[PDB]
């Protein structure tokens, strides 16, 4: 925690270095998708096979 730092504190044993930043913070895509907020905004799924 002093070699590379936390996010609140920089690296004590490096000159100017902080921990890299997450481009997304919650990576649980399944937990994101089946959460209620997205599901109320989704349209109805079209699950039916219309073959020739």
């Amino acid at each position: 925690d002093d070699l590379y730092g936390t996010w609140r504190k920089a690296a004590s044993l490096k000159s100017n270095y902080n921990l890299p930043m997450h481009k997304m913070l919650n990576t649980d895509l399944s937990r994101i998708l089946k959460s209620p907020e997205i599901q109320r905004a989704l349209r109805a799924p079209r699950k039916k096979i219309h073959r020739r």
Partner: protein
């Protein structure tokens, strides 16, 4: 740029969304409260926005906040801002062509004589 684009009338309490980098601008004296979603925010821009009382979101948080992007202002950086576009256009050496040429160095003996002065033959 993000300050002035959310500054427009009717864009209050509303989230700035960019699918690129939010970089700092040091010729900015006052930073108002901004709710921002971006791919990357530069470290000083994070400090300025968070010390301004704002929120920085990422896109997975944006999806849980607004699943259809309601209350959003989608923004872009200047897509002609790179220096390649000053070289792009009409060929320099044709009339009324304000295109930067490719020079190894700039100076009085670097691409200034023949096609660029009326005295040295001709001027375009």
């Amino acid at each position: 740029r993000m300050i002035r684009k959310m500054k427009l009338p009717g864009r209050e309490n509303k989230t700035a969304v960019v699918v690129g980098t939010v970089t700092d601008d040091v010729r900015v004296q006052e930073v108002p409260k901004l709710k921002v979603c971006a791919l990357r925010v530069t470290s000083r821009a994070r400090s300025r926005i968070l010390k301004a009382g704002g929120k920085i979101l990422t896109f997975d948080q944006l999806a849980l906040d607004s699943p259809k992007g309601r209350g959003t202002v989608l923004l872009s950086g200047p897509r002609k801002g790179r220096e390649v576009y000053r070289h792009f256009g009409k060929a320099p050496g044709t009339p009324h062509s304000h295109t930067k040429p490719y020079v190894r160095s700039k100076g009085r003996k670097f691409e200034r004589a023949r096609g660029r002065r009326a005295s040295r033959g001709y001027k375009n």
